[PDB]
Design a binder for these strands. Sequence first.
DNA 1: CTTTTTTGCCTAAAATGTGATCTAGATCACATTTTTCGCATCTTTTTTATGCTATAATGTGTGCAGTCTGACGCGGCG
Length: 49
Amino acid sequence: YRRGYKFSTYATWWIRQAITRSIADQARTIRIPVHMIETINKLNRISRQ
DNA sequence: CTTTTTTGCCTAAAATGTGATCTAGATCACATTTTTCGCATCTTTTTTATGCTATAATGTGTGCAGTCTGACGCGGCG
């Protein structure tokens, strides 16, 4: 509490992390380590630009 | 009687046979230097498990079915 900010922001970071890599861990019959996942995100975004 | 063809001789001559006596060849079972191979180090080198980011954010549906149907079970349904 001492930071004096709204609590929502905090776990809005934490959860986001948890989700963001739990789907990447699971969610496939093929496991893909995170590094490929990241670079795939790079790819997909930059493709569109 | 003359020719030619043949053989045997002359006359020159190569091929055959003495075996006794060595002499460079090849064997022959077992020790040494080279290949470059295989598993332990390093030793990097890359890759991978794990860890944070402090404005703020508060109840789904999500795209579909086109609804077969006749008999029989079974829970109701009275």
